[PDB]
Amino acid sequence: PLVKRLREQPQNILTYLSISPVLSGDKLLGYRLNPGKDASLFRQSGLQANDLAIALNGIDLRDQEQAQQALQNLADMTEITLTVEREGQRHDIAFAL
Ligand SMILES: CCCCCC/C=C\CCCCCCCCCC(=O)O
Numbered sequence: 067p068l069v070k071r072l073r074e075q076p077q078n079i080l081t082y083l084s085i086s087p088v089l090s091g092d093k094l095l096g097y098r099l100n101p102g103k104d105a106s107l108f109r110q111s112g113l114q115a116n117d118l119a120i121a122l123n124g125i126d127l128r129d130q131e132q133a134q135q136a137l138q139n140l141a142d143m144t145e146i147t148l149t150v151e152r153e154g155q156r157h158d159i160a161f162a163l
Pocket residue numbers: 072077078079082085097119122127148161162163
């Protein structure tokens with residue numbers, strides 16, 4: 067699963083984020099995000115509680131093979147962008163790694 071795979075990164079991503087896939091029927095809607103033990107990324111121009119992650123570096127997280135590709139690619143990246151849906155609207159947030 068994607069969460070179990072994010073745990074391999076030297077950045078302690080799961081210290082900053084609590085993540086659950088969101089299912090509807092046979093569809094994955096995205097990944098629901100909330101603060102980890104360190105809530106630093108949650109701020110006005112950053113993430114919000116209950117944001118829905120739908121893309122990583124422009125790759126659709128809802129599509130299983132694409133998401134796999136996006137995750138293998140995060141390994142040697144220096145800055146990554148997350149697209150979230152928040153009360154109907156998309157927002158892009160970048161993170162320095
Ligand atoms: C659903 C897929 C979610 C993947 C999201 C990854 C998002 C953010 C990574 C945040 C890393 C934050 C700390 C990076 C290491 C150094 C930064 C610091 O000084 O804390």
